[PDB]
Nucleic acid binder design. Structure first.
Lengths: 82, 127, 202, 60, 155, 97, 116
RNA sequence: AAGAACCUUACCAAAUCUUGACAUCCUCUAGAGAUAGAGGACAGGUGGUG
RNA sequence: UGGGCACUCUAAGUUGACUGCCGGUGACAAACCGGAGGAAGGUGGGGAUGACGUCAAAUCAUCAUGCCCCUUAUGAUUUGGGCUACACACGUGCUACAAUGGACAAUACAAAGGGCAGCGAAACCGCGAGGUCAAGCAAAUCCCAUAAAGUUGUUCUCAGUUCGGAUUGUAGUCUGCAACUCGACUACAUGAAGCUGGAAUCGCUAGUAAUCGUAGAUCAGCAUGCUACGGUGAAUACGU
């Protein structure tokens, strides 16, 4: 995954709508389609409505989640047993 | 006084140069017992040296390339017989009796399509 | 799947290639230029009895040798018609000034011409048996060692596909030292497509 | 569907990992060779007539 | 098979002991085309049985082979609900094939540490009329002894 | 001086092996014999069927035959007669020079 | 015995020391470079002064307990934040992304068959 | 199918369009991105019936 | 390496294997058995080559096509997801359950291919994937590239083990806008089932069965699949 020279990956438009509102106090429910963006340290206290394919499941970002892409936190398939 | 007798086995070609002298067998400028891993190859190599009595009487300067070691050993053996006639052409009366002047055509098989690799077939079940 | 294609089997052995040029690189574009020319020739020279089209290439120049059973129809009244063919091809990519017309004297001895002649009559509500027998009769009258003809699919407008095959003389399709001209044509009728195959051996 | 995916393949995509190869003669997106830009089907038909230079049946 | 007989592939004499029998024993020990090991297995056992018995390595081997080779086999005929076990005397060529096979198989089935010691152990036991190799022929003879009543059903 | 030719057909490369040594000897010049270079066989394996019938493969080849002819004494009448290449539109010519 | 985990005696140091959890063969070979032990002496033929040198090196690495605790909190963290890896941990399924359709037994466990 | 992260994908969920994705004649700015702003007979259909 | 081109290779042409021959069994003749050269003997061995027809076998999703429908949709462009989901059953393979072995070091012997913005040497760094600079080669010239099984020694001493490497944790490499769904790999940690498989079953009479690696097509990346290439390499096949 990536490299050390390339570093972390966040979609070119995604962080723009993160450092857009951080000068304000309230977090938002920004609708998201990029599941491949790394959850950056500046992603803290921010609901990301990530598209699972049909819906925008919201996710409050805690410190531990920094490092994995928000796609890991958006379940795409559904299964209730057999 | 090089008696040039060619010899081919599988994918190997040996340039046998019979020269007079009692000594070892020098495969690619190396002793036969350092070149060939096993002695059984060295026995098959000296088959025409034994069928007609010339054992060790020549220092075979052989330049073999291709194949493994068994293919190279019999390519030398075939080349030796084709070179024993180069020294004395009245030697075939026992070489044909023991089948040493014939190029062995038992070369590998094609990978037959539809069948698993060579002549064998894959697993077969019934639906 | 029973019969190997007669042309493909004998190509290189007794037959020769139509596209005769070398291209270590740019092979894909050069080859597709050949088909682009051939496809344009197919509809432009449709009513002309065109049998083979050879494309040769040398010194950034495309040589086309068109074997036709109706010379003059392609050439024109001295060259006017062939000039339009040359410049229309000329407008495509490079220059291809060389166009050679070769007369096919025995039209009924060419598989592609016989198959096309059969297919056009079949489209005009003709007997699928009379067209085969008459064409076969002409070729054998012309000295051919043997001719084989086959028409397939909804013969006469029926609801079930059939295959009427008639043969005369010797047509050995298993011998390789023999030039058997083979060609397939289609006849689009109201009831569907037809399949014409001809095996003329001389 | 055809005539839209063919034009899309002809159309230059954004990146260098989006383009793919289609048989220019028929439009098949699978098993297309690079030396001829033809699918395994179109290769057979054209090689049988002899319209591909130097290509003949192999019988080794 | 149906059409006549099949010529057999021959072997050359052993490099050391000069015995075609010895080389064919290598052909039985060999698995997956590995001649190297098989050649080492036998010479590490021929030279080993010399230290156990004392006599020549090939001399004990010849004695042992004779005590494994079967004299009377039991081929199967059929009349109906009863299958006729017809005792047939073993032709000389099949005897050596069976004796060599029973030496290897009943050496593999035993075990102390390795294959060389197992082979050497079975070689000495056979010359002493002991071991599985000689117990296989004793059962082969026994079945031929019991079914002498079917002798005249030999096709 | 290294004139080399590549051809798909062995007959036009044998004819190209000749016909230029003869225009080399047309002038006063020594030319090396046609060197038989290893041909390059490209093998293609395709499924005959238009769908699912595998294990039925049609195999095709394409052999590029190669030759090497070396002019040993290049005279002016050879460089002027070097354009007399009778290429049948399918024989690639590579004069290293 | 090293730091509570007894290693098999009558075994070579390089081989016996891998019996400790958290230490493998490549790590074990590292001890014998620092501690001057010939990697061939049996633990039963080992000298007490050699034991001290070995034991000093061992605790430097993440040897026992800590590695067990570390690996668990790593998975526990994956459980808490409900990622793709960690939810599959709950359900006992291959978390890397292997095919669970027909061949997954070291994660599914016993084959509890359903009749047809 | 001799090559499923996008493509391939022909499947699904959103953002969309309707002379059209294609014939044939008549450098910045938002925005997931498409795309947007600024510097008419006809087509098409991996739709059905081997 | 100068020089030769001798040998060998390379690729064009050209000999040879035709029951010519010698017997003997059939002289109803074909034929059949043995023998002689000869490299090859009885269609020398393999490949391509698949008749009439059969199965309304397969393909309207390669393509075309009669008819039937959609035609602000059954058409069309984008992002995301899915095609990889998992109670399980089936077919086809791979890996092992070690001592003819594991490991540890040295030490050999191929074939066939591919390569231009590709193959990418040599050097340097890194445990290693790999990275930095790079010569040469449009290639019998340079690169992939090193075959490995194999040989020689040392170590283990039958143990779920110095067998086995599934599965997890951590830190990384490459490609790609982007490896979470869902890539290949590399290190360190872990260490599953598995002690040679029941009833049944398939393949094969030579360079075959078995065994070891190499190459190519596709291809940014991705094969235990497929197609090809060689190395080692059994044996009874009496008999119907």
């Amino acid at each position: 995954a990536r490299s050390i020279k390339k570093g972390p990956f966040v979609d070119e438009h995604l962080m723009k709508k993160v450092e857009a509102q951080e000068g304000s106090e309230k977090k938002q429910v920004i609708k998201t389609w990029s599941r491949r963006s790394t959850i950056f340290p500046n992603f803290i206290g921010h609901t990301f409505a990530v598209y699972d394919g049909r819906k925008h499941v919201p996710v409050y970002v805690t410190e531990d989640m920094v490092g994995h892409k928000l796609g890991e936190f958006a379940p795409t398939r559904t299964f209730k047993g057999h | 006084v090089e008696y040039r007798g060619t010899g081919r086995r599988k994918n190997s070609v040996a340039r046998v140069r019979l020269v007079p002298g009692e000594g070892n067998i020098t495969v690619n400028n190396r002793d036969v017992r350092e070149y060939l891993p096993f002695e059984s190859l060295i026995l098959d190599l000296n088959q025409p040296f034994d069928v007609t009595e010339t054992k060790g009487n020549y220092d075979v300067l052989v330049n073999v390339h291709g194949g493994g070691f068994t293919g190279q050993a019999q390519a030398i053996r075939h080349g030796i017989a084709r070179a024993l006639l180069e020294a004395d052409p009245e030697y075939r009366g026992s070489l044909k009796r023991a089948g040493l002047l014939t190029r062995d055509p038992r070369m590998k098989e094609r990978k037959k399509p539809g069948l698993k690799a060579a002549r064998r077939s894959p697993q077969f079940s019934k639906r | 799947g029973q019969k190997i294609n007669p042309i493909g089997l004998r190509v290189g052995i007794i037959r020769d290639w139509e596209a005769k040029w070398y291209a270590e690189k740019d092979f894909a574009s050069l080859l597709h230029e050949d088909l682009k020319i051939r496809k344009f020739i197919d509809n432009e020279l449709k009513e002309a009895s065109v049998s083979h089209v050879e494309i040769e290439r040398a010194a950034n120049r495309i040589n086309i040798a068109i074997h036709t059973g109706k010379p003059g129809m392609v050439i024109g009244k001295g060259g006017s018609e062939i000039e339009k063919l040359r410049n229309k091809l000329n407008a495509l990519t490079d220059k291809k000034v060389h166009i050679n017309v070769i007369e096919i004297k025995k039209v009924d001895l060419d598989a592609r011409l016989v198959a096309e002649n059969i297919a056009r009559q079949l489209e005009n509500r003709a007997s699928f048996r009379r067209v085969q027998k008459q064409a076969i009769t002409r070729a054998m009258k012309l000295g051919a060692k043997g001719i084989k003809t086959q028409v397939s699919g909804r013969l006469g407008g029926a609801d079930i596909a059939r295959a009427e095959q008639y043969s005369e003389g010797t047509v050995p399709l298993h011998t390789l030292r023999a030039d058997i001209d083979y060609a397939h044509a289609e006849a689009d009728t109201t009831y569907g497509k037809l399949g014409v195959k001809v095996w003329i051996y001389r | 569907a055809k005539t839209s995916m063919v034009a899309k393949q002809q159309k230059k995509q954004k990146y260098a990992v989006r383009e793919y190869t289609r048989c220019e003669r028929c439009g098949r997106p699978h098993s297309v060779y690079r030396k001829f830009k033809l699918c395994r089907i179109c290769f057979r038909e054209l090689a049988y007539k002899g319209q591909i230079p130097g290509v003949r049946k192999a019988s080794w | 098979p149906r059409k006549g007989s099949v010529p057999k592939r021959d072997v050359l004499p052993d490099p050391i002991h000069n015995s075609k029998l010895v080389t064919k024993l290598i052909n039985k020990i060999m698995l997956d085309g590995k001649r190297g090991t098989a050649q080492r297995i036998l010479y590490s056992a021929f030279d080993l049985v010399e230290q156990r018995s004392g006599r020549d390595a090939l001399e004990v081997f010849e004695e042992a082979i004779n005590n494994i080779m079967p004299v009377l086999e039991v081929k199967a005929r059929r009349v109906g609900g009863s299958n006729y076990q017809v005792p047939v005397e073993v032709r000389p060529e099949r005897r050596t094939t069976l004796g060599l096979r029973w030496l290897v198989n009943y050496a593999r089935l035993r075990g102390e540490k390795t294959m060389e010691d197992r082979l050497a152990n079975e070689i000495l036991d056979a010359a002493n009329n002991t071991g599985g190799a000689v117990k296989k022929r004793e059962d082969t003879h026994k079945m031929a002894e019991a079914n002498k009543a079917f002798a005249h059903y030999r096709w | 001086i290294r004139i080399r030719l590549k051809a798909y057909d062995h007959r036009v490369i044998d004819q190209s092996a000749e016909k230029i040594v003869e225009t080399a000897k047309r002038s006063g010049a020594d030319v090396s014999g046609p060197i038989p270079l290893p041909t390059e066989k490209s093998v293609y394996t395709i499924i005959r069927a238009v769908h699912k019938y595998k294990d039925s493969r049609e195999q095709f080849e394409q052999r590029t035959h190669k030759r090497l002819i070396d002019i040993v004494n290049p005279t002016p009448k050879t460089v002027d007669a070097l354009m007399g290449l009778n290429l049948p539109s399918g024989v690639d010519i590579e004069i290293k020079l | 015995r090293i730091a509570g985990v007894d290693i098999p005696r009558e075994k070579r140091v390089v081989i016996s020391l891998t019996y400790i959890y958290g230490i493998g063969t490549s790590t074990a070979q590292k001890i014998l470079e620092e501690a001057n032990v010939s990697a061939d002496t049996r633990v039963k033929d080992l000298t007490d002064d050699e034991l001290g040198r070995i034991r000093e090196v061992v605790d430097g690495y993440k040897v026992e307990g800590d590695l067990r605790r570390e690996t668990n909190l790593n998975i526990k963290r994956l459980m808490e934040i409900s990622s793709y890896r960690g939810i599959r941990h709950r359900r006992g399924l291959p978390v890397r992304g292997q095919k669970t359709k027909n061949n997954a037994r070291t994660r599914k466990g016993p084959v509890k068959t359903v009749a047809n």
